[PDB]
Design a protein around this ligand. Structure first.
Ligand SMILES: [Mg+2]
Ligand SMILES: [Mg+2]
Ligand SMILES: [Mg+2]
Ligand SMILES: [Mg+2]
Ligand SMILES: [Mg+2]
Ligand SMILES: [Mg+2]
Ligand SMILES: [Mg+2]
Ligand SMILES: [Mg+2]
Ligand SMILES: [Mg+2]
Ligand SMILES: [Mg+2]
Ligand SMILES: [Mg+2]
Ligand SMILES: [Mg+2]
Ligand SMILES: [Mg+2]
Ligand SMILES: [Mg+2]
Ligand SMILES: [Mg+2]
Ligand SMILES: [Mg+2]
Ligand SMILES: [Mg+2]
Ligand SMILES: [Mg+2]
Ligand SMILES: [Mg+2]
Ligand SMILES: [Mg+2]
Ligand SMILES: [Mg+2]
Ligand SMILES: [Mg+2]
Ligand SMILES: [Mg+2]
Ligand SMILES: [Mg+2]
Ligand SMILES: [Mg+2]
Ligand SMILES: [Mg+2]
Ligand SMILES: [Mg+2]
Ligand SMILES: [Mg+2]
Ligand SMILES: [Mg+2]
Ligand SMILES: [Zn+2]
Ligand SMILES: [Zn+2]
Lengths: 96, 91, 135, 251, 77, 112
RNA sequence: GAUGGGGAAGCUCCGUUUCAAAGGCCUGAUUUUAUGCAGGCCACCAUCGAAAGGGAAUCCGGUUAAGAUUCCGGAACCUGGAUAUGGAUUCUUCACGGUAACGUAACUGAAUGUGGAGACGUCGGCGCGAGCCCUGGGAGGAGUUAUCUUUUCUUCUUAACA
RNA sequence: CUUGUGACGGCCCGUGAAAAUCCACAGGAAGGAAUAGUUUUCAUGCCAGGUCGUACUGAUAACCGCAGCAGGUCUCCAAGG
RNA sequence: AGAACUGGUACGGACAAGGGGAAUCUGACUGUCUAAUUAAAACAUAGCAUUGCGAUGGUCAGAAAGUGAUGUUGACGCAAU
């Protein structure tokens, strides 16, 4: 699957959770990749890639809702979007 | 503690209306009062306003659904059936 | 790569000038003592120019092309950066951190940006920036 | 004898429906140039409960193509329609739940509701909660369509008649027993004055054909011919058969 | 019904060309548990509202009453 | 323990006939009628009570100045602040999408 | 419940927007002059129906043999209309400040459209307010006192509006 | 204790009026300054506010019960033990 | 809540305030009616069953209508038992 790559990011690299943090990270140019949950508000979705398009950042859309993305990163709450500040030891940046 | 054995929510009707009738209303009433997933906000915040009207306390979204549940079996078949024809006609 | 630079055009989403096009003149990523948050020194337009047709002659055109600019400190959280751009050279000097904190030099700072704004608008320059955002 | 009850309803003195709290007549959008040549878009604003009606209402807002106004329509909500959802109505609309495709441009086996028996009457068929209509097949020449009604009867109707895609919300309403005269009382309090009902056999002979006798009994046959006149139609009118249904309906 | 706290505002208000009368009220008040002082109130009957000016100083009270215009009808009570 | 009576000719405890017993400088208890409580104006979009606006019965709004009935932002006394923010966001993105769709549409037709 | 209409020999009946050629709204011109021409605009299309539904705006003190939220005194508010001054704003013509929620003494805006208020069930408990009840100290008055009782009763209040 | 109000919660196959009226916003037609204007949602300043009811009872005597009838007739406030 | 002490065993001391049990017939229950002799085992009721009807319709009204109620309704509906 893909979540196993995400799990290695958490234990090795650095990341942010939530819409406000990622846009701040995306604004400063420190974000390498963002992940959007399927059930994200499409308006909130739409401004994200436009923000990404400005920052020249790869975009990937998670095949799951808020809960699945939250469990994907090993958190007990729901996450609508995550940002990859540094892979650390993962391989998501090169692939997909 | 466990207040009742079997009547559950239907204990308010006392010893009347008949056991079988109390049995059937119990099954439907639990679905009526239950909380459901928000298909938009992904939360246990969907409740029934009136018969067939289900709304999300957060995210302020309302969807029309079953009188006693968020969606009945027939619509689930219909929605798939609609989707079956949709990709059959576009391609 | 960061994109909030000294020539970008953004849209204010909150405040008295909500929905007004602004151009960033001086960014400040790591806040400041007066503003401990990512803020900028944008310059915008409050009264967008009116539509002009062939019928108006030589004075209605002048009246309908008036521009009311403004300068403000704005948090980055209250802006939408755009893919458009508009260079700032004739009024990047006047717009500065000390241009504020007393009204005296605020107006002629606005006077200079007013001249630059209309001058570009007099020619066929940056139509989208001068077009009012309808919503 | 005295005028029996069923006659007395026709005068409409106190037997008219109670229509104070209803939000309006639930009709489809009028059939105009846009719908029969393209499609139009709408926004679902309110999903309101209608008094005296099991199904909920859908309150969709449209744009007038000829004048700068905001014509607002009242639909019958289909199961699966949410507020803020875009609704497409017209001949060229995409086949999605809540859309108002004409029956001509929809493939067989589709589910529709609030179907028009004639083009432009703004919805007649299958307007109750949990009800729906099958499209069996089309007749391309002399455009004309065959559909299945909730009654199980097969009806053939014009291909240009419209009908919204989906199933009317609020299904399964009749499953729950009421358990209470009050529940029946409050239910009929908003429909019309037709409750409670008094048995004709428990009546004086002046009041009803069944009335009278030292024992409560009908006396004559209770199957009344359709050729009878008003005041005799009290019982089973034009009953083809009677008694418990054992076996297939063979319809 | 409206309070004026500016003596300069009060004095010009007496020249509003509509006010015809005014009254001066003397009160005995206690600033605290021990000292009773004399309270004076200046009320000017405007055309649309009554303006009251309160002075807690006897010295300032006297300087004001000589400064009232002579054409104004003053009532002492 | 004085007992008060209605000051008007309507003896029925209706909504317009609510009273509040009050004590007068005369030392007696006299009932006074209180008007119906004002309802806060609501947003047209988010349906919440938009703030910064004085809440009176509708007729009194003709009396107060313009300041009490508005806010210094676009859609001042009409829409919620967050409602304004999202519709500005909605406008810019969709309009920008229209160029994106248009350049794609004319590109794909030019190929053939 | 008229009208347009349609029935009924007829007294009258049906119907209330219906198979109707169903009108005023405001601006400006003309200053022989009154208002037609200049325009533009709009589409419900009579009316009646609540002294408890909705609703613009008032309180206090005093007065009579009998009236008072109506009379007297004082102090307010609303609607409609004529306006003059002060204030405000303008040479960047139709204001500024705050990151923001938003603030102020003001701080143009026709046609048209949108929204809000009007405008709303019942029950249960909780919080808060007002009035009343209880009670202490003190400042006055009255009662009981063969005996006891720092005692018993009573006055100490503050409206609308700002 | 009475009452008002706020935030809540429960109930429905019952979700629990309408209109008059007032305001705001979107809109930018129109009109606008420098030797002078613009402004009557800021303050002050002037005038007027017609017509009809207004007393009293509201009940073991002012209402209907042939009557000064133990009957009937809607509602507000409710001290101490 | 408990403990002593006390009285002609009194003490919810006036007021206030359920008799209970064993069974049979009948109606399931709450509810409604013969104002002024019958309140019930009668009626209603939820549940069960049957019938008619796809609107150019079913049931019902009017003498007639360019007329009506169900119907601001559409078989999980309306109408008749
Ligand atoms: Mg009845
Ligand atoms: Mg009988
Ligand atoms: Mg007979
Ligand atoms: Mg019989
Ligand atoms: Mg009233
Ligand atoms: Mg404000
Ligand atoms: Mg305010
Ligand atoms: Mg008539
Ligand atoms: Mg009237
Ligand atoms: Mg009234
Ligand atoms: Mg009401
Ligand atoms: Mg008052
Ligand atoms: Mg009197
Ligand atoms: Mg007076
Ligand atoms: Mg100012
Ligand atoms: Mg409203
Ligand atoms: Mg006071
Ligand atoms: Mg009460
Ligand atoms: Mg509730
Ligand atoms: Mg009187
Ligand atoms: Mg009187
Ligand atoms: Mg009296
Ligand atoms: Mg009385
Ligand atoms: Mg009395
Ligand atoms: Mg009498
Ligand atoms: Mg009797
Ligand atoms: Mg009896
Ligand atoms: Mg029976
Ligand atoms: Mg019929
Ligand atoms: Zn939600
Ligand atoms: Zn909002």
């Amino acid at each position: 699957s893909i979540n196993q790559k995400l799990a290695l990011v958490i234990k090795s690299g650095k990341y942010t959770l939530g819409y406000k943090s990622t846009v701040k990270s995306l604004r400063q140019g420190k974000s390498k990749l963002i992940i959007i949950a399927a059930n994200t508000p499409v308006l909130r979705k739409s401004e994200l890639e436009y923000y990404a398009m400005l920052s020249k950042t790869k975009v990937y859309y998670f095949q799951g809702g808020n809960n699945e993305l939250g469990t994907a990163v090993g958190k007990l709450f729901r996450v609508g979007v995550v940002s990859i500040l540094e892979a650390g030891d993962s391989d998501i940046l090169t692939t997909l | 503690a466990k207040r009742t054995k079997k009547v559950g929510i239907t204990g308010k009707y006392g010893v009347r209306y008949g056991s079988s009738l109390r049995r059937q209303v119990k099954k439907l009433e639990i679905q009526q009062h239950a909380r459901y997933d928000c298909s938009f906000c992904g939360k246990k915040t969907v409740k029934r306003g009136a018969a067939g009207i289900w709304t999300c306390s957060c995210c302020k979204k309302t969807v029309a659904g079953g009188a006693y549940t968020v969606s009945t079996a027939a619509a689930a078949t219909v929605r798939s059936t609609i989707r079956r024809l949709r990709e059959m006609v576009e391609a | 790569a960061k994109f909030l630079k000294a020539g970008k055009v953004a849209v204010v989403v909150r405040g008295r000038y909500a929905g007004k096009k602004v151009v960033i003149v001086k960014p400040h990523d790591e806040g400041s003592k007066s503003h401990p948050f990512g803020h900028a020194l944008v310059a915008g337009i409050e009264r967008y120019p009116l539509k002009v047709t062939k019928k108006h002659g030589a004075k209605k055109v002048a009246k309908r092309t008036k521009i009311k600019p403004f300068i403000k400190v704005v948090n980055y959280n209250h802006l939408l950066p755009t893919r458009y751009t508009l260079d700032v050279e004739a009024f990047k000097s006047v717009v500065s951190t000390e241009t504020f904190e007393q009204p005296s030099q605020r107006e002629e700072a606005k006077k200079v940006v007013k001249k630059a704004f209309e001058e570009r608008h007099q020619a066929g320059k940056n139509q989208w920036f001068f077009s009012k955002l309808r919503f | 004898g005295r005028v029996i009850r069923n006659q007395r309803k026709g005068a409409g003195s106190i037997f008219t429906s109670h229509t104070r709290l209803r939000q309006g007549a639930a009709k489809l959008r009028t059939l105009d140039y846009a719908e029969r040549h393209g499609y139009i878009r709408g926004i679902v604003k309110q999903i309101v409960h209608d008094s005296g009606r099991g199904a909920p209402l859908a309150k969709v807002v449209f744009r007038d193509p000829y004048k700068y106004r905001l014509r607002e329509e009242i639909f019958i909500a289909n199961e699966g329609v949410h507020t803020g959802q875009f609704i497409y109505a017209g001949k060229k609309a995409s086949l999605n739940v809540g859309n108002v495709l004409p029956l001509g441009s929809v493939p067989e086996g589709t589910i529709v509701s609030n179907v028009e028996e004639k083009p432009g009457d703004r919805g007649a068929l299958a307007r109750a909660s949990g009800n729906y209509v099958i499209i069996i097949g089309h007749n391309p020449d002399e455009n004309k369509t065959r559909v299945r009604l909730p009654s199980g009867a097969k009806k053939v109707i014009s291909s240009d008649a419209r009908g919204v895609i989906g199933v009317i919300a609020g299904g399964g309403r009749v499953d729950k027993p009421l358990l209470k005269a009050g529940r029946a009382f409050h239910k009929y309090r908003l429909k019309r004055n037709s409750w409670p009902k008094t048995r004709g056999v428990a009546m004086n002979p002046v009041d009803h054909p069944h009335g009278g006798g030292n024992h409560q009994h009908i006396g004559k046959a209770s199957t009344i011919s359709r050729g009878a006149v008003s005041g005799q139609k009290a019982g089973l009118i034009a009953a083809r058969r009677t008694g418990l249904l054992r076996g297939s309906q063979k319809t | 019904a409206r309070e004026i706290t500016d003596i300069k505002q009060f004095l010009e208000l007496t020249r509003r060309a509509d006010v015809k009368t005014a009254t001066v009220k003397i009160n005995k008040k206690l600033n605290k548990a021990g000292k009773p002082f004399r309270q004076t109130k200046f009320k000017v009957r405007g055309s649309s509202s009554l303006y009251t000016l309160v002075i807690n100083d006897a010295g300032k009270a006297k300087k004001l009453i000589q400064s009232l215009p002579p054409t104004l009808k003053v009532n002492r009570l | 323990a004085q007992r008060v009576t209605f000051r008007r000719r309507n003896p029925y405890n209706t909504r317009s006939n609510k009273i509040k017993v009050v004590k007068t400088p005369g030392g007696i208890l006299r009932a006074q009628h209180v008007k119906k409580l004002a309802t806060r104006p609501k947003c047209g979009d988010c349906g919440s009570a938009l703030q910064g606006i004085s809440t009176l019965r509708p007729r009194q709004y003709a009396t107060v100045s313009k300041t009490h009935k508005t806010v210094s932002r676009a859609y001042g006394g009409s829409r919620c602040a967050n409602c304004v923010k999202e519709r500005i966001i909605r406008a810019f993105l969709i309009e920008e999408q229209k160029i994106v769709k248009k350049v794609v549409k004319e590109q794909t037709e030019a190929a053939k």
